[PDB]
Amino acid sequence: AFDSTWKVDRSENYDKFMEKMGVNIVKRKLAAHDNLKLTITQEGNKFTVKESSTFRNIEVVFELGVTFNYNLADGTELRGTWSLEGNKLIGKFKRTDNGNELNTVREIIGDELVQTYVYEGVEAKRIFKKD
């Protein structure tokens, strides 16, 4: 289901994830602590995800199974699919420029949305409370 406004409390291991992408010592500090709010709205199969932070305020409009570019706000695109396994969004993604695969799991732990991004064995969790 997912449909709600979700402000970031914490961003766990996101600095080492952005080192394995390949960034300078600016985007590691700023994009881990950018104040990201996810307003998720599903109109008819398509999820309209309004992503508002210090870097960018944009709506990611995706149907379940469509291959799209997810942009990190640095110099890094991920091409792939958020698909719904019952109540969990399984993200089958890969890099445009490296070619390397990325598994990302969106799920609610009670009253907090975890987006669990695994790149090169390195797991990063951006954790958003209901707010």
Curated annotation (Swiss-Prot):
Positions that bind hexadecanoate: W82, R106
InterPro entries: Calycin (IPR012674), FABP2 (IPR031272), Fatty_acid-bd (IPR000463), ILBP (IPR031259), Lipocln_cytosolic_FA-bd_dom (IPR000566)
Protein localization: Cytoplasm
Binding site for tetradecanoate: W82, R106
Keyword Cytoplasm appears in the UniProt entry: yes
Entry text on domains: Forms a beta-barrel structure that accommodates the hydrophobic ligand in its interior.
Family note: Belongs to the calycin superfamily. Fatty-acid binding protein (FABP) family.
Coarse class of the protein's main subcellular location: cytoplasm
Factors inducing expression: By EGF.
Residue numbers bearing the N-acetylalanine modification: A1
Keywords in alphabetical order: Acetylation, Cytoplasm, Lipid-binding, Transport
GO BP: fatty acid metabolic process; fatty acid transport; intestinal lipid absorption
Function: FABPs are thought to play a role in the intracellular transport of long-chain fatty acids and their acyl-CoA esters. FABP2 is probably involved in triglyceride-rich lipoprotein synthesis. Binds saturated long-chain fatty acids with a high affinity, but binds with a lower affinity to unsaturated long-chain fatty acids. FABP2 may also help maintain energy homeostasis by functioning as a lipid sensor.
Protein name: Fatty acid-binding protein, intestinal
Tissue-level expression: Expressed in the small intestine and at much lower levels in the large intestine. Highest expression levels in the jejunum.
Phenotype when changing T54A: May have a lower affinity for long-chain fatty acids, such as oleate and arachidonate, compared to T-54
Superkingdom in the source lineage: Eukaryota
Entry annotated with the keyword Metal-binding: no
GO molecular-function term, one example from the UniProt record: long-chain fatty acid transmembrane transporter activity
One GO CC annotation: nucleus
